UniProtKB/Swiss-Prot annotation:
Composed of an N-terminal stalk, a dynein-like core comprised of two catalytically active and four inactive ATPase domains, and a C-terminal E3 module. The ATPase regions do not generate movement but rather act like an intricate molecular 'switch'. The RING-type zinc finger domain is required for the ubiquitin-protein ligase activity. It is found in: Cytoplasm, Cytosol; Lipid droplet. It is linked to Moyamoya disease 2: A progressive cerebral angiopathy characterized by bilateral intracranial carotid artery stenosis and telangiectatic vessels in the region of the basal ganglia. The abnormal vessels resemble a 'puff of smoke' (moyamoya) on cerebral angiogram. Affected individuals can develop transient ischemic attacks and/or cerebral infarction, and rupture of the collateral vessels can cause intracranial hemorrhage. Hemiplegia of sudden onset and epileptic seizures constitute the prevailing presentation in childhood, while subarachnoid bleeding occurs more frequently in adults. A chromosomal aberration involving RNF213 is associated with anaplastic large-cell lymphoma (ALCL). Translocation t(2;17)(p23;q25) with ALK. This is E3 ubiquitin-protein ligase RNF213. Monomer. Interacts with UBE2L3/UBCH7; UBE2L3/UBCH7 is the most efficient ubiquitin-conjugating enzyme E2 for the ubiquitin ligase activity. Interacts with UBE2N/UBC13; promoting 'Lys-63'-linked ubiquitination of target proteins. Induction: Down-regulated by let-7c miRNA, which binds to the 3'-UTR transcript of RNF213. Induced by pro-inflammatory cytokines. (Microbial infection) Up-regulated in macrophages infected by M.tuberculosis. Autoubiquitinated. Disulfide bonds: none annotated. The chain holds residues 1311 to 1535 of 5207 of the full protein. Atypical E3 ubiquitin ligase that can catalyze ubiquitination of both proteins and lipids, and which is involved in various processes, such as lipid metabolism, angiogenesis and cell-autonomous immunity. Acts as a key immune sensor by catalyzing ubiquitination of the lipid A moiety of bacterial lipopolysaccharide (LPS) via its RZ-type zinc-finger: restricts the proliferation of cytosolic bacteria, such as Salmonella, by generating the bacterial ubiquitin coat through the ubiquitination of LPS. Widely expressed (at protein level).
């Protein structure tokens, strides 16, 4: 997986036994194997999207994705087939999810399990503009140590990037509307490779983020002062 040039080399090594002269046919199998792997990746993406649905609280029906899960559950009887006899519905499901890579699946994962963080963020801010105010109070709380101060920047960047999903999303968002709210996060992850990990780090330190609002607001940590 993801080493298809190595696959081609290996298959030529298999050719060395001198069968099927000129051995070009393997190029076709290579693409077919790519499809199977990419097909399975779309399957994983589908589950993550379903988890995001329950995590964020969408309402738009996403029953069509079940098609891929329908393959994943009946993996045993379907596996009696070949590489080309798979079906065209799975091909079309690949067509839909073509623009998702494993990194985007990982961002979505970072979002899924963090329902509590989604809720606390939606209740506290509701508008990314308020984030700026919240960030100021967080700076008072940190403690002048690098990890503590950096928590603030990690949270700021996470919320600034994951904004469309967290704040403005409409519960009735359908498939394609979700894909566009996704394209914004897509461009953001393209600009920053660590944004999912920042989201996870922010969500793990939820208790401090909560503490910010009530207590940390004023006392003005006083180490260099």
């Amino acid at each position: 997986v993801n080493k298809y040039t190595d696959l081609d080399s290996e298959l030529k090594i298999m050719c060395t036994v001198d069968h099927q002269d000129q051995r070009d046919w393997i190029k076709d199998r290579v693409e077919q194997i790519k499809e199977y792997h990419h097909l399975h990746q779309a399957v994983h993406a589908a589950k993550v999207i379903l988890q995001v649905k329950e995590s964020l609280g969408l309402n738009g029906d996403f029953s069509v994705l079940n098609t891929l899960l329908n393959f994943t559950d009946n993996f045993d009887d379907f596996r009696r087939e070949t590489l080309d006899q798979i079906n065209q519905e799975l091909i079309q499901a690949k067509k839909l999810l073509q623009d998702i890579s494993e990194a985007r699946c990982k961002g979505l994962q970072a979002l899924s399990l963090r329902k509590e963080f989604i809720c606390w963020v939606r209740e506290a801010l509701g508008g990314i503009n308020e984030l700026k105010v919240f960030v100021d109070l967080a700076s008072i709380s940190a403690g002048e140590n690098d990890i503590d101060v950096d928590r603030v920047a990690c949270f700021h960047d996470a919320v600034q990037g994951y904004a469309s999903l967290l704040f403005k999303l409409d519960p009735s968002v359908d498939f394609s509307a979700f894909m566009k709210h996704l394209k914004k996060l897509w461009k953001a992850l393209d600009k920053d490779q660590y944004l999912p990990r920042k989201l996870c780090d922010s969500a793990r330190n939820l208790e401090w983020l909560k503490t910010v609002n009530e207590s940390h607001g004023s006392v003005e940590r006083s180490s260099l002062t």
